[PDB]
């Protein structure tokens, strides 16, 4: 009668950067299924009545103006280059303002995001590569120069920023139902 | 800081001849980060060659780039009259992205003596208490010309200013304007005002003068 | 049309600040790096600094490190270059350059150039010119042709525009570049050569316009 | 109009812990766009930033003050406090509380200070506290017929700084000069406060100097009359 | 750590003069600079922020300008109340730092009024005698006070104190205290302070006789 480890995901003291978003695989357990809460392809009042093959718990941090991108069929720097959800996504997205946890007076430059990438991310793709991005014709060869920039930047979360620039911790729960046996049942 | 030195400072060539411009850096720069530009009179610079030897879009094939390390070359195989401009090289792989002093390309032509004209000050100006006497040297080549002012056979120095037009797009000549500035009081004390012109196209210096 | 359009001419008192604009059109501006270069009248190009695409990460030459700030606005598609503590030696034409880009790919060099912004630093206020005739005479004729002109004198700042007969006269015109007089004001002359026999039956008017002072003058040059 | 009223002891023995409090008036301390800061100024020296704080807890301290600085906020009392531990004589300074405006956007110009507390001098010393003696500085009998005379109060042998002097309960300020205290060889401070008044008023107008020395709970009102012979 | 260097350290200008103070940053901080005015005994008062934006409630004769590394504060017409120490502050990087300050002094030469005060009978009851000499409302700041006790020049037993510049007439005041024992005070008779100053064509001596009214 194992209980699903949701406490470890929502109540984690430190969250991952959006470009290196974390995923917790949850299986073979019983779950008791100012917050941004949007579900897609499935109703929340029905999750306690459904069993799934696997439930994937994706967690990361973005800024407030970027939470609208964590959704199916969305475009933008976060959706295309950091964390993409498929068009037929079945699950829920949860976000809450974490300005009291992830913002420092001198600036919390620890949280990063990808700015440049040659192509768009596939659904659920995680790219932690930090190779010098070639924006021109000449080969960069790991040289930060003209048309050769570093692909990651910092959020620099400060408490004096506006809500659109304040940190938001995001937890994306994917509900998978392939073949296999259904082990994650709500109760 | 990388120093870029271009030579020669000025190149005067007949149309159809081949031009050859030098760009040299105080240290080796990567060939992909050396660019050549062309700036025509009254225009912004235009990218000609980048990556040492890659012609930019729209640049005619008679422009050619070459070189590596510390010695780069721009070659204009058949010079056209429209190719008159200042040509700059720039390295932009190591900050600061320094420029060269540029090479000015004139269109060759034969020696042409100037036409000298003098203009006394107008009465409207003399009412203002000042007097400007103007000497005009029209349609000459080469650009080197000496203009000397004489007031009652007294050589003037330090009270005249000169100006030269850009090279003419049709006949490739220059024109110069020298202005002698005197007070109305000083101007009324004298009689013979003359500008003496020395130039390669003249057998001996030419003097244009008037009597007040 | 792939374009880079800079702001208009400026006159700034010594010790003040100027902020030159550089708006883009045609290409993806957010993907495009931008460098700033200036050129003093009759000198060589001088590199000021450059800024990387996407972020505000700028890099400057040591000469301008203390007082030049290069910024960019992604929403309005415009880059800026602010030069504080202006002094006499800063008078120059300031250019912005950028490689053209689409959404993913960029050129390998700076092929897009702005038209340039002329900034002049001086302590003197604006002043319209005085237009004096350069009347034709026996001492300004040669071989059937005569020369005449206009003396555009004692103005500030640059520039002035001179045409002849409302633009009907272009052949044989020479408008010389202005010289900076010891008074701090500029002085220019424009001349034209015409056949001597036209002096009696044809009128010649030089059209002088000094936009900074809103001074338009049409001066008729009659034989002397 | 936001006001800041600081308070706390002006005397702290060496190795003890300095403690000061600032009370915000005309506005709540749970400001979402301001920091609450402390700044100190050694006597005869410049300004040194100590630290800044957001109401919800986050702090930024000066790395030049090691780990002996703590700022705190009491939202329920509209107060924020400063605690500086293991103080030395190098900590003797006038301490100010102030309000710092924070940025609302990335790379927005902020971080200036407005308004400020009035300033509290904290003297790091073991020496014991002593209240002053107030002696009159009587106007000279000679003086003039109808010109101007001078009188004052001598505030002698007190520690630590400061004392405050007013005249006639604040109704006399024109012509008043209260001199900076001098540290006597005895280790105790001393100062004089003088005022120039017309000579004709010396018999008809009373002059009292009001001497306050908070560290010793001393309040002295001293009348200054022309001396009788 | 961003260091701010303020030049000059001191300056003295006349009323109506145009004053210019420079603040040079060790690195370029764009326009992240503010100016403060601190009058004696008062907290610093914000004048300019963002290098050139005047604070609401500051006279228009104050103005700031500059960008990058060098910034200037200008007082177009100096007034007597403008006597203060002015500080610049960088507002870009932590830790927040100030410049060293520029003390601005103010006028025509003004001679001092001199007064001498005997030790009160209340203090003589305590065993110590203090003799105070007052130099009132003089400019410039430099003044010389000699203590003579029976025409014997004293040294080593007197301390001085000078007020900050007055915010209305721009003058200074000085007090000199002669400290003696009650026994030593009663041994001599004539007490005098002799004052010299730029505004005095010859020394001024205010004296009293111990005991004599």
PDB file of N, CA and C in Angstrom, chain C residues 40-72:
ATOM      1  N   UNK C  40      34.467  60.903 -37.831  1.00  0.00           N
ATOM      2  CA  UNK C  40      34.581  62.354 -37.834  1.00  0.00           C
ATOM      3  C   UNK C  40      34.858  62.857 -39.244  1.00  0.00           C
ATOM      4  N   UNK C  41      34.446  64.101 -39.507  1.00  0.00           N
ATOM      5  CA  UNK C  41      34.481  64.678 -40.847  1.00  0.00           C
ATOM      6  C   UNK C  41      35.870  64.579 -41.467  1.00  0.00           C
ATOM      7  N   UNK C  42      36.010  63.731 -42.484  1.00  0.00           N
ATOM      8  CA  UNK C  42      37.283  63.568 -43.152  1.00  0.00           C
ATOM      9  C   UNK C  42      38.275  62.689 -42.429  1.00  0.00           C
ATOM     10  N   UNK C  43      37.803  61.764 -41.605  1.00  0.00           N
ATOM     11  CA  UNK C  43      38.673  60.868 -40.857  1.00  0.00           C
ATOM     12  C   UNK C  43      38.340  59.419 -41.209  1.00  0.00           C
ATOM     13  N   UNK C  44      38.877  58.497 -40.420  1.00  0.00           N
ATOM     14  CA  UNK C  44      38.625  57.078 -40.605  1.00  0.00           C
ATOM     15  C   UNK C  44      37.494  56.622 -39.693  1.00  0.00           C
ATOM     16  N   UNK C  45      36.994  55.420 -39.966  1.00  0.00           N
ATOM     17  CA  UNK C  45      35.954  54.838 -39.131  1.00  0.00           C
ATOM     18  C   UNK C  45      36.519  54.460 -37.768  1.00  0.00           C
ATOM     19  N   UNK C  46      35.696  54.627 -36.734  1.00  0.00           N
ATOM     20  CA  UNK C  46      36.094  54.313 -35.368  1.00  0.00           C
ATOM     21  C   UNK C  46      35.036  53.419 -34.741  1.00  0.00           C
ATOM     22  N   UNK C  47      35.441  52.218 -34.336  1.00  0.00           N
ATOM     23  CA  UNK C  47      34.512  51.264 -33.746  1.00  0.00           C
ATOM     24  C   UNK C  47      34.159  51.682 -32.324  1.00  0.00           C
ATOM     25  N   UNK C  48      32.867  51.664 -32.003  1.00  0.00           N
ATOM     26  CA  UNK C  48      32.406  52.079 -30.683  1.00  0.00           C
ATOM     27  C   UNK C  48      32.114  50.855 -29.828  1.00  0.00           C
ATOM     28  N   UNK C  49      31.237  49.988 -30.312  1.00  0.00           N
ATOM     29  CA  UNK C  49      30.886  48.801 -29.558  1.00  0.00           C
ATOM     30  C   UNK C  49      29.889  47.966 -30.329  1.00  0.00           C
ATOM     31  N   UNK C  50      29.549  46.823 -29.742  1.00  0.00           N
ATOM     32  CA  UNK C  50      28.574  45.931 -30.346  1.00  0.00           C
ATOM     33  C   UNK C  50      27.782  45.241 -29.248  1.00  0.00           C
ATOM     34  N   UNK C  51      26.631  44.700 -29.635  1.00  0.00           N
ATOM     35  CA  UNK C  51      25.717  44.049 -28.706  1.00  0.00           C
ATOM     36  C   UNK C  51      25.245  42.743 -29.333  1.00  0.00           C
ATOM     37  N   UNK C  52      25.147  41.701 -28.513  1.00  0.00           N
ATOM     38  CA  UNK C  52      24.791  40.365 -28.986  1.00  0.00           C
ATOM     39  C   UNK C  52      23.281  40.277 -29.168  1.00  0.00           C
ATOM     40  N   UNK C  53      22.793  39.413 -30.052  1.00  0.00           N
ATOM     41  CA  UNK C  53      21.342  39.268 -30.210  1.00  0.00           C
ATOM     42  C   UNK C  53      20.712  38.606 -28.995  1.00  0.00           C
ATOM     43  N   UNK C  54      19.473  38.983 -28.732  1.00  0.00           N
ATOM     44  CA  UNK C  54      18.698  38.392 -27.647  1.00  0.00           C
ATOM     45  C   UNK C  54      18.801  39.068 -26.300  1.00  0.00           C
ATOM     46  N   UNK C  55      20.019  39.232 -25.796  1.00  0.00           N
ATOM     47  CA  UNK C  55      20.263  39.812 -24.485  1.00  0.00           C
ATOM     48  C   UNK C  55      20.805  41.229 -24.631  1.00  0.00           C
ATOM     49  N   UNK C  56      21.020  41.874 -23.490  1.00  0.00           N
ATOM     50  CA  UNK C  56      21.646  43.174 -23.440  1.00  0.00           C
ATOM     51  C   UNK C  56      23.152  43.144 -23.300  1.00  0.00           C
ATOM     52  N   UNK C  57      23.775  41.975 -23.442  1.00  0.00           N
ATOM     53  CA  UNK C  57      25.222  41.857 -23.301  1.00  0.00           C
ATOM     54  C   UNK C  57      25.941  42.685 -24.360  1.00  0.00           C
ATOM     55  N   UNK C  58      26.560  43.785 -23.940  1.00  0.00           N
ATOM     56  CA  UNK C  58      27.279  44.682 -24.832  1.00  0.00           C
ATOM     57  C   UNK C  58      28.778  44.594 -24.578  1.00  0.00           C
ATOM     58  N   UNK C  59      29.543  45.049 -25.568  1.00  0.00           N
ATOM     59  CA  UNK C  59      30.992  45.124 -25.477  1.00  0.00           C
ATOM     60  C   UNK C  59      31.443  46.419 -26.129  1.00  0.00           C
ATOM     61  N   UNK C  60      32.342  47.135 -25.463  1.00  0.00           N
ATOM     62  CA  UNK C  60      32.761  48.453 -25.913  1.00  0.00           C
ATOM     63  C   UNK C  60      34.271  48.503 -26.072  1.00  0.00           C
ATOM     64  N   UNK C  61      34.727  49.425 -26.915  1.00  0.00           N
ATOM     65  CA  UNK C  61      36.138  49.763 -26.946  1.00  0.00           C
ATOM     66  C   UNK C  61      36.513  50.507 -25.669  1.00  0.00           C
ATOM     67  N   UNK C  62      37.799  50.432 -25.320  1.00  0.00           N
ATOM     68  CA  UNK C  62      38.274  51.078 -24.099  1.00  0.00           C
ATOM     69  C   UNK C  62      38.040  52.583 -24.130  1.00  0.00           C
ATOM     70  N   UNK C  63      38.125  53.196 -25.313  1.00  0.00           N
ATOM     71  CA  UNK C  63      37.989  54.646 -25.416  1.00  0.00           C
ATOM     72  C   UNK C  63      36.594  55.108 -25.008  1.00  0.00           C
ATOM     73  N   UNK C  64      35.566  54.323 -25.328  1.00  0.00           N
ATOM     74  CA  UNK C  64      34.186  54.697 -25.053  1.00  0.00           C
ATOM     75  C   UNK C  64      33.568  53.889 -23.919  1.00  0.00           C
ATOM     76  N   UNK C  65      34.373  53.121 -23.181  1.00  0.00           N
ATOM     77  CA  UNK C  65      33.831  52.249 -22.143  1.00  0.00           C
ATOM     78  C   UNK C  65      33.121  53.042 -21.050  1.00  0.00           C
ATOM     79  N   UNK C  66      33.624  54.234 -20.732  1.00  0.00           N
ATOM     80  CA  UNK C  66      33.129  54.956 -19.567  1.00  0.00           C
ATOM     81  C   UNK C  66      31.817  55.685 -19.828  1.00  0.00           C
ATOM     82  N   UNK C  67      31.565  56.114 -21.064  1.00  0.00           N
ATOM     83  CA  UNK C  67      30.467  57.033 -21.318  1.00  0.00           C
ATOM     84  C   UNK C  67      29.507  56.601 -22.418  1.00  0.00           C
ATOM     85  N   UNK C  68      29.765  55.493 -23.105  1.00  0.00           N
ATOM     86  CA  UNK C  68      28.858  54.981 -24.130  1.00  0.00           C
ATOM     87  C   UNK C  68      28.088  53.798 -23.567  1.00  0.00           C
ATOM     88  N   UNK C  69      26.778  53.782 -23.804  1.00  0.00           N
ATOM     89  CA  UNK C  69      25.917  52.681 -23.395  1.00  0.00           C
ATOM     90  C   UNK C  69      25.088  52.250 -24.594  1.00  0.00           C
ATOM     91  N   UNK C  70      25.248  50.997 -25.008  1.00  0.00           N
ATOM     92  CA  UNK C  70      24.547  50.450 -26.163  1.00  0.00           C
ATOM     93  C   UNK C  70      23.440  49.537 -25.663  1.00  0.00           C
ATOM     94  N   UNK C  71      22.205  49.857 -26.031  1.00  0.00           N
ATOM     95  CA  UNK C  71      21.030  49.121 -25.597  1.00  0.00           C
ATOM     96  C   UNK C  71      20.228  48.690 -26.821  1.00  0.00           C
ATOM     97  N   UNK C  72      19.154  47.943 -26.574  1.00  0.00           N
ATOM     98  CA  UNK C  72      18.288  47.475 -27.646  1.00  0.00           C
ATOM     99  C   UNK C  72      16.926  47.139 -27.061  1.00  0.00           C
TER     100      UNK C  72
END
